[PDB]
Structure formats: structure tokens, C-alpha cells
Design a protein around this ligand. Sequence first.
Ligand SMILES: CN1C[C@H](Nc2nc3c(c(=O)n2C)CCC3)C[C@H](c2ccccc2)C1
Ligand SMILES: CN1C[C@H](Nc2nc3c(c(=O)n2C)CCC3)C[C@H](c2ccccc2)C1
Ligand SMILES: CN1C[C@H](Nc2nc3c(c(=O)n2C)CCC3)C[C@H](c2ccccc2)C1
Ligand SMILES: CN1C[C@H](Nc2nc3c(c(=O)n2C)CCC3)C[C@H](c2ccccc2)C1
Ligand SMILES: CN1C[C@H](Nc2nc3c(c(=O)n2C)CCC3)C[C@H](c2ccccc2)C1
Ligand SMILES: CN1C[C@H](Nc2nc3c(c(=O)n2C)CCC3)C[C@H](c2ccccc2)C1
Lengths: 118, 118, 118, 118, 118, 118
Amino acid sequence: DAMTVLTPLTEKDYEGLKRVLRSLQAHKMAWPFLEPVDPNDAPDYYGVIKEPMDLATMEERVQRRYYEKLTEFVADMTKIFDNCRYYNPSDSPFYQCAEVLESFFVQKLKGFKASRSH
Amino acid sequence: DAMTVLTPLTEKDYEGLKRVLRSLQAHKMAWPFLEPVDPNDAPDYYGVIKEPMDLATMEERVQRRYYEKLTEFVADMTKIFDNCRYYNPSDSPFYQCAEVLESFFVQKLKGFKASRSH
Amino acid sequence: DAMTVLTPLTEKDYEGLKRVLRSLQAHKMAWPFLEPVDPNDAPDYYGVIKEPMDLATMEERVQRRYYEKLTEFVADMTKIFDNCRYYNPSDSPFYQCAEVLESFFVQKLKGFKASRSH
Amino acid sequence: DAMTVLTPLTEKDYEGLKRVLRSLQAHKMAWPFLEPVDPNDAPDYYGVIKEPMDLATMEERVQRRYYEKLTEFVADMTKIFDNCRYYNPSDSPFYQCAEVLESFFVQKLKGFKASRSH
Amino acid sequence: DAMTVLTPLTEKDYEGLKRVLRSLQAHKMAWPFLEPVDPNDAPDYYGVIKEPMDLATMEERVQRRYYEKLTEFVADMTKIFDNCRYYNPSDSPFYQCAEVLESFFVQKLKGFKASRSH
Amino acid sequence: DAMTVLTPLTEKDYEGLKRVLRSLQAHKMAWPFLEPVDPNDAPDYYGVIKEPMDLATMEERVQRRYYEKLTEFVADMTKIFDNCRYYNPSDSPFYQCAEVLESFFVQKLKGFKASRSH
Ligand SMILES: CN1C[C@H](Nc2nc3c(c(=O)n2C)CCC3)C[C@H](c2ccccc2)C1
Ligand SMILES: CN1C[C@H](Nc2nc3c(c(=O)n2C)CCC3)C[C@H](c2ccccc2)C1
Ligand SMILES: CN1C[C@H](Nc2nc3c(c(=O)n2C)CCC3)C[C@H](c2ccccc2)C1
Ligand SMILES: CN1C[C@H](Nc2nc3c(c(=O)n2C)CCC3)C[C@H](c2ccccc2)C1
Ligand SMILES: CN1C[C@H](Nc2nc3c(c(=O)n2C)CCC3)C[C@H](c2ccccc2)C1
Ligand SMILES: CN1C[C@H](Nc2nc3c(c(=O)n2C)CCC3)C[C@H](c2ccccc2)C1
């Protein structure tokens, strides 16, 4: 979509970004992405993931208006999952929780790209 | 079913394992993972992706009958697309090809799991 | 076709002209042509394109009844795509989008050069 | 296609860049694109057209091994057809010859894009 | 002057017009402006100058009694020198020739205005 | 003058180039040239004038020591006036302001050429 790349993010938009973000935080499968990875559960995590991400941190950025474009937002989200699938094994819960939450996200994202324009 | 996990791969199994692979080798979108990553293109690749995977390397492995359970061949397949979304940017052509191939694989693999049980 | 050049435009015709225009304004790939180019996007545009055109300026015209023959309407349409391809790079979005819609409008117009003879 | 944008043009490539070019110089409708637009035919042309092109200027460029990728060769071909539809009227001969000849180039170009994959 | 704008040109007017014009055609430096710019000298000229002009085209216009007010005769003359300084480099002879000739025109034009105001 | 063409610009030179440029911005008739032309005032301006210019861009350039010779500096100035006279009517004020200011600059420039040598 044109507008996703090009049309910048208004106060209205950011309002509905917080709305989507909260939906993720209340999701049943979000339990592994609400906060940052603990370096004690996994030394080498921050050493082998170049750009880690969580919803705790995406909440900061949505409240600090970090994202000039809907594009910078959908990147940082997809980090959460691409990073989770990369570091964990295909048969782990952490992986499954990411596959589920990403599908959900896309739906909650599809509704936001639609409600922007018409 | 997941007799995927438990039921060793027989010879007729390895049949559609090779056929499913030819079909990924055909795809117009398979080009990015037909062969191993060249480290002239990307020096730091091999140092930052832990278990690289191509389809050439995987095709060898279907010839050595490297795989005792279907579980193993699908781990190694999904490596390719997880490595790719990890290493590249989301709006990348590579990243789009992994998104598209994998969905293909998944439909071609859905077929295989059913043409094993009944 | 003879009918397009000499037989002029009935009150009917002008209904199925506004109806095709409508169809182009729906399309997914019509987004770059629904209104006039902005001069702040492109300060040289209006000085180097001799006859710009948009579906908004064309809805005005179809309504005002500006077009005596069908030849006139299809010119003003084709300005939109030839101007685009001229001013924008072959490999660009705007360009690709013009390709999609000229291809479409053609068939949506083949269906009008046929509802005007039987 | 990935190969078109990224694979550098070998000398075998260039051999049958000359074939595609001469097959176009042969065409029955290629006649108005063989040589540069004459300033006496159209005093404004070279002022109102930012980058003119022709098959002769491109025969020179294809001989002097000027094109690093296939991407650059098709860009200059489609200039001939974009500059033409832009400058001339939709109902002019020159305009139809670009319609006819580009459409043909496109097929010669399909056949060369697959002569390369293998 | 009020007269130059408002007082229509009569026959004795048009006779001073022709005297002024020939004085210019005589000038040591009128040479670049005696006739239309040749598109073979400068392919882009006619496409990048919206209203070219010459002392020849104007001598026709003075014979045809084309000018209703002195205002329009002066306008078309200042086109010659404006279009020349615009198109050409300032250190060029054509640029210098317009600088000189116009200053000449101006003294001759002054004369003509008081040869009128009585 | 020899010195204007050949003798590069010292730090002292540049001091008095800003001195002159200031004087221009002081002038009551500088008002149409103090900053760049607005594309919304005039959509075609930037597409049909090839090298625009303004005292604001010229201040930047004098502060970046962009001009090796007094010759480049005086060109860029004279764009402002030639561009104005070309795009606008002889009888317009923008035109009449270009005239007045250009005459001024010449005088201020006369004095700067003279303050260089003795
Ligand atoms: C901080 N801590 C991070 C956890 N999330 C996570 N930890 C690791 C990886 C990973 O990919 N993720 C997504 C790879 C390495 C370790 C979720 C966890 C949690 C535990 C119990 C009840 C709810 C939540 C809290
Ligand atoms: C062998 N060589 C490997 C390339 N594939 C690839 N290169 C890189 C990454 C990646 O993720 N991939 C999948 C990240 C870093 C660089 C594809 C390339 C190729 C070019 C044109 C037509 C087909 C194939 C050939
Ligand atoms: C009005 N404004 C005009 C744009 N269209 C356009 N702009 C330019 C060219 C061109 O060829 N086109 C078609 C070349 C020069 C710049 C479309 C744009 C738009 C942005 C976001 C979402 C929808 C629409 C809005
Ligand atoms: C050199 N001269 C150029 C002509 N081609 C051309 N002239 C013009 C435009 C244009 O778009 N084209 C393509 C717009 C402005 C005039 C073709 C002409 C020719 C005549 C007969 C047999 C072959 C060739 C040769
Ligand atoms: C017809 N042809 C036109 C020339 N004049 C001219 N050519 C150009 C520009 C321009 O500004 N001018 C005034 C800019 C673009 C090229 C003068 C030329 C001539 C040469 C020698 C002796 C007398 C006449 C005759
Ligand atoms: C930025 N904006 C540019 C204007 N200057 C200008 N605009 C145009 C042309 C031109 O030639 N000039 C010199 C032709 C095309 C439109 C002057 C204007 C202004 C208005 C009031 C008080 C001071 C300044 C400011």
C-alpha cells in the first residue's frame, strides 16, 4: 500500500497504534514478548540477535512518537517474531507463540491500514 | 498426522521427499536459496547466521538419506526462510521470496503428510 | 472502430462513461491518479508535462459534458498514463501503477465499445 | 526477475543483445526509430524531450559494451516508446508503431530472459 | 508614458515604426537577431523558449500592421533580448549583442516617443 | 577586467562579496528575490526555468566559499534577473524590480571591482 510507506503518521493514527498494541498485550499468546529477553535466561541472546525487540519497548516508542511512518512501526514489530524464530527451534513454544501472535497482528494490522483511508 | 515425529522415513517416503524438493527447486521464487550464500556478496553472513541452509545442500542430504524422521527435514527446510527473514530487511526481495516459498512448501508439505497415512 | 470516431455521445453513453471512470476510481492501483499532481512533490512537473490529467479532473469533465466524441475521452485518459511513463522511471511504482490501470481501462473500455454496437 | 537486475552482462550475453537489437531493426514497424529524430522535422523535440533514443544510438552503445546490467539496456529501449507516446498524439502512426514495436520487443525480451536462465 | 499604452498607432506612427526597425537591421550588432534561430544550430532552442523572435518576423508584423498599440511592438522586441540573455551564457557574444542592441533600441525608442507626443 | 576572470578570490574578496550581497538584501526592490520562488505561486516555474536563483541561495553559497572566481559569482547573480525577465511580463513589477536591482548591483559591483586593484 501507498499510504503505508508515504502518508506520515498523524495524532489520529498514533491513537489507533496504541489501540492495536494494547490488543497484542492482552493476547493470550503474548506472554513471551511483553518485556525484553532476560540475559540470564539466555546469555549470548543480545550477542547474537543484532536488534532485539519487545512490546514493552514498542510501547515506549509509540508514546514518544518515534515512528514517522507506518513502515518503521511494522519493522520493529516483525523483529519480535523474526528474532524469536531465528534464535529458537521450530518445535519450541516460544516459536509457536510467535507464529500465532504474528498472524493475529497481521489481522489487527489489516484493520488499521483499512481504517486509515476510508 | 504427527506420525511426522515418530514414524521413520521409509524408501517410498524418500520418494516424495525428493519430489517435494524438485518442486521447491522449480518455483520462480526459489532462486535465492537454490545454492549456498556467497561470502563475496556478504562477508559477515557465515559469521552471523549459525546454521546456513540452501536447497543444493539439502538435496545432497536427501541423497545420503540423512533424515530418519520427517521432523528433521522440516527443521532444515525452515532454517532457510528463518535465516533469511533474520538476515535481511523485511521489505527486501529475499525476505519476500522466503515468505512466498515457505507458504508454497507448507502446501506441498501438507500434501506429503496426508499421502503417508491415508 | 467507426463508431468511436463519428457516432457522437448520447445521454446513455455518458452514463457508462461516468460508470467506467467510477471503476477506475475503485481500483487498487488507481491510487496515484485519483487527483492532480502536487507541485510540492515535483516542482518541475507542471513545467515539463504539457497536458496533465487525473481522474478527478476527468470526473469534472464527464459531468460538464466536455466530450463530443469518444475519441476525446480516451485521449484525456491516455494522457494520464503516457505522462506518467514519460516523467517517471520504468522501474518505479507510479510507472508500474500506470501499466496496471491502462491495461485495465482498456478492457473496461473494450466492454463499452461493445455495449454501444449491440 | 532477479537475474535481469543483478547478473552482470557477459560477452555471451552481449552477442544476443545484438540479435534482439537487429531483430528490431528488421521489423516492419521499426522504421521511425532507426535514427535520431531530426531537428528540422520538429524544432521543439529536443527541448521538450529530456532523453531521446533510437536504435542506431543503441547499436553504438551495445557495441561499445556500455551496459553493465540487462536492467540498463531495457531502460533505454523503453525510452524510445515512452518518449514517442508522450510527444505524439495517441492516433498518430509513430504512436502506433511504438505500441506495435514495444509489444514485439517485449516478446524478443521474454525469449532472451529465458535464454539466460539456462 | 500614457501615450505608449493608450494612443493607437496611426499611419505616420507606423512610418516611424519602420524607420526604427531598419535602424536596428542596419546595426553593426544586429546580426544575431536578423532572422529566426536555426533549429540545426540549437535543437533544444525551440522547445525551451516559449516565444522566439527576430527582426525579420517583426518586419512582416510591421508591414501587416499587426500592432494596435506601441505597447505590443516594444514587447515583441524585448522578447529578442530577453530570450537571448536567458538561453545564452552571459560571457557570450550573442549575450553582449543583445545588451548593446537593446540599449540602442532604447535610444531609438525614446526618440520615437517624443516624435509622437506633440 | 583581467582580475575578474583570472585572479582567484581571497578571504578579503569574500568579505566584500558578503558586503555587497547584504546591500542587495537591504534594497527596497530586493523583495521578490530574497528567497526562492514558490512552486505553489507558479507550478511550471521550476520545470521551464533551468537554473533558478535567489539572494538566499547566494548567501549560503558565499558562506560555503563556493566561488573560486568573481566570474562565477556574477553569473549566479545575473541568473536572478535574466530568469525574472524571461519568465515574467515586461510590464510586470517582478520585471521592473529585476531591472532596478540589477542596475544597483552593477553599481555595487563596479565599486567592488575597483576596490580589488588599487
Ligand atoms: C523475560 N522473559 C522473556 C521471555 N520471552 C523470551 N525469552 C527467551 C527467548 C525468547 O525468544 N523470548 C520471546 C530466547 C531466550 C530466552 C518471556 C518470559 C516469561 C516467563 C514466564 C512467564 C511469562 C513470560 C520473560
Ligand atoms: C549464490 N548466490 C546466493 C544468493 N542468495 C542469497 N544471498 C545473500 C543473502 C540471502 O539470504 N540469500 C538467499 C543475505 C546475504 C547475501 C542468490 C544469488 C543469486 C543471484 C541471482 C539469481 C539467483 C541467485 C547466488
Ligand atoms: C496528489 N498526489 C499526487 C500523486 N500522484 C503522482 N505524483 C507525482 C508524479 C506522478 O506521476 N503521479 C501519479 C510525478 C511527480 C509526483 C499521488 C499522491 C498520493 C500519495 C499517497 C497516497 C495516494 C496518492 C498524491
Ligand atoms: C529521422 N527521421 C526521424 C523519424 N522518426 C520520428 N520523427 C518525429 C517524431 C518521432 O517520435 N519519431 C519517432 C516526433 C517529431 C518528428 C522517422 C523518419 C523516417 C521517415 C521515413 C522512413 C523511416 C524513418 C526519420
Ligand atoms: C540563423 N542564424 C541564427 C543566429 N542567431 C542566433 N543563434 C542561436 C542563439 C541566439 O540567441 N541567436 C541570436 C541561441 C541558439 C543559437 C545567427 C546566425 C548568424 C551567423 C552569422 C552571421 C549572421 C547570422 C543566423
Ligand atoms: C517566495 N516568494 C517568491 C516571490 N518572488 C517571485 N515569485 C514568482 C516569480 C518571480 O519571478 N519572483 C521573483 C515568477 C513565478 C512566481 C516573491 C514572494 C514575495 C511576496 C511578497 C513579498 C515578498 C516576497 C516570495
